């Protein structure tokens, strides 16, 4: 009866079902957990918001077209405006979180295409000016739930001031490595003939027990079309990709007034 | 007359000392001494002060 294709995930007041899964990945074989006393750093009693924040948040959907080059998000950036998770994140200097990432993309038995879904620790990307190095604005690095897109062309700006964004070049994974090697990162593939969803469970990953969520993204989420969307009756068809992410084992330290980041 | 002692831990562990000289002045640094009594400077008071009690009763 039980199947690698059929899964239920419940966190807080939220449940996901899938009937065409392909198992689930636990990044580096490690389930998320709370911070042990023997690895702790800040000494204030932490906030552990539990079900208020540790629940599935669904981002705005994106459209997969035959011409799409791919999509990226950063975490916890993508969830910074999500209910009580966002409030706990911005009221505290420090936060840590694992995640359940659920990527959703259904089609038909007559569609074809394959998405690589990669969870990348410290997903540092190239800037878009050759007048400077490491020259990216906070606003362009932290787009929130809209994330960003890859391009198949690199056109760095004439003026340094116009190039303060990522050069998200697909085949170099936006960071000077070949995209074919992205499989060293925790991943699944959504191959439309096989599966309609990817599930990645991510532990907290950092060189520290806990860090400034508003300064630092622990994970990149990359969705690359490895094989282009094709549908014989309409080559210009679009199918949605929906990203749903639950924080897990969230813990916050250093309560004060709320952080309100710059928007320009 | 070799002395075997614990090393200070690194990134990831005993070491051996033999004294070669007849004068202790020739010896390498004294072993780590973690002794401390801050109270002789931070609380040099005649009558014990219990933190939870009033300083002046």
């Amino acid at each position: 009866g039980y199947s690698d294709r059929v899964r239920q995930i419940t966190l807080g007041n939220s449940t996901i079902t899938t009937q065409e899964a392909a198992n689930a990945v636990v990044a580096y074989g490690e389930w998320p957990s709370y911070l042990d006393d023997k690895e702790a750093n800040p000494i204030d009693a932490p906030t552990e918001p539990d079900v208020s924040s540790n629940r599935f948040y669904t981002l705005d959907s994106v459209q997969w077209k035959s011409t799409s080059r791919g999509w990226w998000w950063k975490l916890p950036d993508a969830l910074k405006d999500m209910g009580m998770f966002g409030q706990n994140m911005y009221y505290h200097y420090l936060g840590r979180s694992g995640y359940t990432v659920h990527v959703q993309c259904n089609a038909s038995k007559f569609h074809q295409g394959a998405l690589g879904v990669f969870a990348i620790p410290e997903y540092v990307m190239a800037c878009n000016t050759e007048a400077k190095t490491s020259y990216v604005s906070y606003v362009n690095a932290n787009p929130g739930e809209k994330g960003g897109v890859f391009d198949n062309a690199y056109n760095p700006s004439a003026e340094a001031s116009e190039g303060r964004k990522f050069a998200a070049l697909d085949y170099l994974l936006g960071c000077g490595v070949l995209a074919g090697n992205a499989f060293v990162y925790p991943h699944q593939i959504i191959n439309l003939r096989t599966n309609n969803s990817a599930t990645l469970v991510l532990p907290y990953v950092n060189s520290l027990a806990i860090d400034c969520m508003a300064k630092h993204n622990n994970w990149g989420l990359v969705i690359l079309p490895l094989c282009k969307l094709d549908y014989a009756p309409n080559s210009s068809t679009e199918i949605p990709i929906t990203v749903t992410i639950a924080p897990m084992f969230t813990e916050f330290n250093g309560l004060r007034n709320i952080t309100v980041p710059a928007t320009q | 007359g070799a002395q075997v002692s614990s090393q200070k831990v690194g990134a990831h562990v005993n070491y051996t000392t033999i004294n070669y000289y007849k004068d202790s002045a020739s010896n390498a640094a004294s072993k780590l001494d973690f002794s401390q009594d801050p109270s002789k400077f931070t609380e040099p008071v005649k009558d014990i002060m219990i933190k939870t009690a009033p300083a002046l009763n």
């Binding site: 009693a45 | 931070t42 040099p44 933190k51 939870t52 009690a53 300083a55 002046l56």
Partner: peptide
């Protein structure tokens, strides 16, 4: 020998007032 660990503590509502002192004492 290590620097001091922090114990688990919650709040108080008490006649014990460790926040107040008198540095006139020389402490």
């Amino acid at each position: 020998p290590t620097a001091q660990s922090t114990p688990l503590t919650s709040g108080v509502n008490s006649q014990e007032v460790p926040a107040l002192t008198a540095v006139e004492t020389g402490a």
